[PDB]
Amino acid sequence: QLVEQEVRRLLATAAYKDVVLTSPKEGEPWLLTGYIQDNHARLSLQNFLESHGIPFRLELRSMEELRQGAEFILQRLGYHGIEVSLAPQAGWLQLNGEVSEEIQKQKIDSLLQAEVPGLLGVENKVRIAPNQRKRLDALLEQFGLDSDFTVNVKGELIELRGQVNDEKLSSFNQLQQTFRQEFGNRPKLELVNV
Incomplete structure (x- = not known):
């Protein structure tokens, strides 16, 4: 009526x-x-x-409360490079930004659903972040340096330890130039004579 x-x-x-x-x-x-x-x-x-x-x-x-909820969950779980927006479907959110390969394996879309009441789905458009360790090891192997240097990671500081001779020093200098061209100033490579 x-x-x-x-x-x-x-x-x-x-x-x-x-x-x-x-x-x-x-x-x-x-x-x-x-x-x-x-x-x-x-x-x-x-x-x-x-x-x-x-x-x-x-x-x-x-939807704004779902979006804010998702932001809070990502923050408390240590995700920093991710922006939350609305997706086209009712009850759905969208993620953009980047995460590491390992962290992608945590299936954050379904995890957000477990943590945010009424979240019907997440369209996850994040990209995979630079994997500096993997690329470093690829370069060491490519140059035949993987037995000369041992990699030690502490935070964003990576030490390449070895018995440094002239050959190893010049090879390090090339590796460092190549690494920097790709990654800029993070993480940093330090040569360490042991």
Whole structure:
């Protein structure tokens, strides 16, 4: 009837495009479920329902609250290079940025779903970050230096330890030039005579 028609006209607007109304029977509250873009939109719908003398229950989630939740979870789990935005589907988020190969294996999309209530899915567009260790070892092997130098990693400081002679010093200098051209100033390679 009329009031239901008025409510459904509001639900046909873009702010309420992810809200569902299940009509009650006699004497039960009207049930509205789904998603809204932010809490402000929820409050406006509440206002509208109350002005029609409608008894109701809202079971709605804010996409901005899902997005902020996901940001908090990524932060507390030590992920720093990831930006969270909305995906095209209701209840879905999107990730951009970069992570290491090892960390990608943690299946962060499903992990975010476990940690963020009402998250229906994640479109994960992050790329794989530079793997400096892997490239260093590839270069050492490519140049026949992998038995001359031993790699010791402490944070972003990588020591190449060996019994340094003139050959090894000049080979190190070439390796370091090549490494720097690709990675800039992180991590740093130090030559260490032992």
